Ligand binder design. Structure first.
Ligand SMILES: Nc1ncnc2c1ncn2[C@@H]1O[C@H](COP(=O)(O)OP(=O)(O)O)[C@@H](O)[C@H]1O
Ligand SMILES: Nc1ncnc2c1ncn2[C@@H]1O[C@H](COP(=O)(O)OP(=O)(O)O)[C@@H](O)[C@H]1O
Ligand SMILES: Nc1ncnc2c1ncn2[C@@H]1O[C@H](COP(=O)(O)OP(=O)(O)O)[C@@H](O)[C@H]1O
Ligand SMILES: C[S@](=O)(CC[C@H](N)C(=O)O)=NP(=O)(O)O
Ligand SMILES: C[S@](=O)(CC[C@H](N)C(=O)O)=NP(=O)(O)O
Ligand SMILES: C[S@](=O)(CC[C@H](N)C(=O)O)=NP(=O)(O)O
Ligand SMILES: [Mg+2]
Ligand SMILES: [Mg+2]
Ligand SMILES: [Mg+2]
Ligand SMILES: [Mg+2]
Ligand SMILES: [Mg+2]
Ligand SMILES: [Mg+2]
Ligand SMILES: [Mg+2]
Ligand SMILES: [Mg+2]
Ligand SMILES: [Mg+2]
Lengths: 429, 429, 429
């Protein structure tokens, strides 16, 4: 069946033909069902410079061609169908568009019979619409993680969204209040990277939209409050043959194969550049290497290291047959994040990279007793690392340079902003 | 029947897989019904350091394995089923988890054919959401105990909660307004210790949840107002054989057996360390040994003594065949409280402990006369006594040392806080 | 010099025995005239850890021995005499004290018959006491530099201070409104470095004091407003023989000698580490490499370069026989600044350092035109450079290590502060 028939069968009156730009912003046209057939073949036209794609106002329209397999009837508004799209320019997929960049990396891995599957942990906060405070003034205790009371106080919002994921078939399996006051996490089944990436992009839209209907606001900001735990977007990772075998399952340490350790070697080896992509904002660097929070731990990475089932490192091994990359934050691009992770891991496999020694220690407490490379400390340093990393920059194609350009502009803007701390501590010099 | 079938049968859309931590905080994940079968067998995963379990962020996930027999469909929201769970760590029940600690003491006792049954008197206040005052501004008289007017003014909340307990089969039998303005008590049938402990944990959650739905707020704080009676959590206690005989029933004084008096002897003998557990907060020590209240009596213990049917001692004998321990307050952990009480009682029975002479006097008025040992006067001293008590510390296992550690941290935090009384009386020194 | 007799003669009732700590803070004891004799010999005691000296509370008292030659009767309150002092510890001048550290460098240069003389341009803003805005709401035009109206609107403050400098014999010669709205500059004759350093320390204190008496507030903050020119503290520099000849006076380009150019070579060669000392705050790095201001130019350095009479470089040659280092800002330590500049310049002279090619262009406009090294972009990088620079670190001795430690701590504190720009631009990620 084609989209026009489906629209008629399911009662879809409009479609959002949607794409994700380099900064993660969802761009779309809302097209009435009468126009979907033509759009589905030829794509919907956009002026690319108006989005974060690093183009020019003089360029021809890009055409975003929807992937009919990605269709989602908005569970909160079923007369509307959401579609993920590949941006095309000059008759070909446009290499600066995140989804296109990911599919390229995926195609290279697939040609080696290695298929990335991943799940995302999209932690978010529920806050007042004005952004001044969390949504629940009674959520105050020092260790609020897994709080039953505060979770159930937001039951209506959380249950509504979980039930939508049940109906969409994502296989959600748990929800909780997370470690910061105001913060939540809703988990669902991993899938082929592309599937998860589209789900990741839609999920954020869904949470934000539903929150708003409830008179709340959701944020995925990496570090919205200085003294509270931040928003991670941990990525659990495994690589599979087309025949359905998990290449990461093995007889080695912690139930991992040498292929899993080499992939891990790639993450470790390329970590500095990876950070630019998966911690893509100035604020990202206040979540990494952060002072101890009120709850007693940041739970985010400080160092380029890994442990076993241990949440104090860049990588955790949570169970046999997979790796948890704890590095990414809530701002990480749903498509660029897996693309950069795969480029790194693939190079790790191809070069049989050594991940180094597993550290079975609490890095927050004992990191001083061990020599370990620190992660890049600010956005500018991460971006330089990205630019200097041939495997990453090469693997992401033109997206990498465009991304770096934008982040450098953001940095230049940020660095000129006077802060209150400066006024307080310098006025009397 | 398994949880998945029950969910379909009864229309349960989500389960709360819940455990109680060392500070009594309810920790939970909300899992959709599709995922309960896996969770019931393997348990829900948590990072234990994020709760009050005294672990490390570097530790592997604990697994909370729900007890299917504990299942409660939330009477105010039947699409959600609540389950109490045992925390497991590294393949075994985690001894720092209160519910596990209790089960361990129960198993020892049960190996001697002695089964603890207890009922709890969970006094609470209904207060304004902001915590500034009690919920009912017309509840003002000096002696408000059993006030018909003020009870019926909160009929809707109280009656709703009692009806839920009727329907859950807890066998509730009375409700009243208690001795402080704003304060209430709802009583239900005693049961095997583990059942009562689970019910106790659920009850506080239910009262808080329903209070909130009525625009009100419930608190179990031991001494929320300095001039009014505090919140106790008295435990009525008896020991039974597997065959169904109450070992406390006897031919001695007041219808008690030698076994009852030896148990009492353990309570008396271990009372100092027991206080740390059942009066577990700084504020607990403002309910114990308190100045007379507006109603004419504190009704809380001052001394390590017992009476007959007499509410002025640490222990009351309310009727043949049971003891009322009046020591515990509203902050007492639903699992550690019975665990510590049992450990002391068992040691009393095993050593044939002598509880001493029953005191048939009003200890508030005639205490000055008799030579009696006073209870610990503050949290720090009570905790010292706990650590010094081999039977208690040993019987609670690693929970004892974890608990002490947290309480010491709370004390240190508390002792540095400047109070208004100090400013008023010292500013002009 | 007999301070007791002077007190009687000039009517001095109290002395401020004053030292400058590593962060530039003026530390002092106010001693009645009856006690000056004893203090002048033995010093006034302080607990050094309570100031920014990097000591320990377990250390013996430091003793601040006043320099009677530095005596200044507060022109606005002549019953008080101010004295600059050298901190001593365990019987020897304390090497971490800025004045002591400066005198050490001066002594080395003096042994080679080279005597540093310098003048300082202590730009400041006059602001509202609450620090929210500038003091004069009518000072608003885009190019306010040398504004006659706005200067005369603050005649009373400016004139009062200038007349004080006339009377103290400092040889003031001009005052103006500077390039930022609210900003002013008052200039006086150069002198022997130690003399200028003491005058500099006193000047800041006198301006702040007099501003306050007029219901205003003075700040020397490097960049108090993002869009306006910042506060520099340019130093004009020359080296003299004990016989009274200016060694910088010469036949080379622009009336400079080979010695001047070799001194300049030290400045250029050591610029990266020098930045840490003369741009000592986080905020300093918003004045350097700043975006264009409303007035059309920042007038501060971006690059490690020099020009002729040209205000767009790190060093300007303003006239025959001297150099202007435009690098330092208003937070520069009055003693550490000259000390570090001298260490760098002496090394230049000793190694006949080559300053490179003079650039006769506007670096703000034609920086892209030529390869030039950029100055450190932030405090942490500048401090790192200080530590790696043997001449500077060695030249300032222990003061450099201690300075670097405090500034690292400042950075740690600063980098965890959430800013409004982050909230605005990241909440919707
Ligand atoms: N073999 C696998 N490869 C990739 N992801 C997996 C694999 N197995 C499970 N996952 C996914 O990993 C994610 C785990 O999330 P979560 O339960 O929140 O982990 P955590 O223990 O870090 O809190 C889920 O999305 C899950 O589906
Ligand atoms: N043999 C027993 N052992 C333990 N608890 C019991 C026994 N008999 C009754 N109880 C319980 O004791 C509790 C009494 O509560 P309550 O009526 O408020 O007592 P009181 O106000 O007199 O102190 C109830 O939970 C009741 O079920
Ligand atoms: N030979 C010299 N060595 C050091 N400083 C000098 C020398 N000659 C003049 N100065 C001082 O340099 C400073 C010049 O300040 P200023 O007039 O504000 O210069 P400009 O604004 O042109 O940069 C004055 O303090 C002046 O006394
Ligand atoms: C409890 S936590 O470790 C918290 C992570 C933190 N929010 C962060 O990554 O910044 N998350 P999880 O156990 O779900 O992996
Ligand atoms: C009337 S009272 O004695 C009050 C007890 C008091 N609230 C306390 O234990 O602090 N309780 P009960 O008669 O229910 O045992
Ligand atoms: C007009 S200016 O060049 C401005 C300097 C600026 N305030 C700065 O150095 O940041 N000062 P001057 O001419 O007095 O040397
Ligand atoms: Mg998770
Ligand atoms: Mg999480
Ligand atoms: Mg995780
Ligand atoms: Mg009762
Ligand atoms: Mg009662
Ligand atoms: Mg009772
Ligand atoms: Mg000047
Ligand atoms: Mg100037
Ligand atoms: Mg100048």
């Amino acid at each position: 069946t084609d989209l026009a028939s489906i629209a008629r069968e399911k009662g879809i009156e409009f479609f959002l033909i949607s794409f994700t730009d380099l900064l993660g912003v969802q761009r779309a046209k809302l097209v009435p069902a009468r126009a979907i057939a033509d759009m589905a073949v030829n794509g919907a036209g956009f002026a690319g410079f108006a989005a974060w794609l690093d183009m020019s106002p003089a360029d021809a329209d890009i055409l975003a061609i929807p992937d009919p397999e990605s269709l989602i009837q908005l569970p909160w508004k079923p007369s509307v169908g959401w579609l993920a799209a590949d941006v095309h320019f000059e008759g070909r997929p446009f290499p600066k568009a995140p989804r296109v960049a990911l599919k390229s990396v995926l195609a290279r891995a697939a040609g080696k019979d290695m298929h990335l599957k991943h799940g995302v942990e999209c932690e978010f906060f529920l806050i007042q619409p004005d952004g001044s405070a969390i949504s629940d003034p009674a959520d105050t205790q020092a260790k609020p993680c897994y709080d039953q009371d505060a979770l159930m106080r937001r039951f209506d919002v959380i249950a509504e969204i979980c039930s939508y994921m049940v109906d969409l078939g994502w296989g959600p399996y748990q929800n909780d209040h997370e470690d910061a006051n105001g913060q939540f996490e809703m988990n669902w089944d991993y899938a082929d990277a592309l599937v998860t990436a589209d789900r990741h992009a839609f999920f954020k839209f869904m949470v934000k939209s539903v929150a708003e209907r409830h008179g709340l606001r959701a944020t995925f900001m990496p570090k919205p409050f200085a003294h509270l735990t931040g928003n991670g977007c941990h990525t659990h990772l495994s690589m599979w043959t087309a025949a359905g075998d998990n290449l990461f399952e093995g007889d080695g340490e912690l139930g991992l194969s040498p292929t899993a350790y080499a992939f891990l070697g790639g993450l470790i080896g390329h970590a500095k550049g990876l950070t630019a992509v998966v911690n893509p904002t100035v604020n990202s660097y206040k979540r990494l290497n952060a002072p101890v929070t009120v709850s007693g731990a940041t739970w985010s990475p400080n160092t380029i290291t890994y442990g076993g089932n241990n949440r104090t490192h860049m990588v955790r091994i949570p169970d046999a047959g997979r790796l948890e990359l704890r590095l990414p934050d809530g701002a990480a691009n749903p498509y660029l994040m897996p693309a950069a992770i795969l480029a790194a891991g693939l190079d790790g496999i191809e070069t049989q990279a050594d991940p180094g020694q597993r550290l079975d220690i609490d890095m927050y407490v004992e990191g001083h007793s061990v020599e370990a490379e620190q992660l890049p400390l600010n956005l500018l340093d991460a971006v330089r690392a990205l630019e200097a990393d041939e495997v990453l920059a090469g693997g992401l194609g033109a997206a990498a340079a465009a991304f770096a350009k934008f982040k450098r502009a953001e940095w230049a803007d940020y660095k000129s902003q006077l802060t209150e701390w400066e006024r307080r501590t310098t006025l009397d010099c």
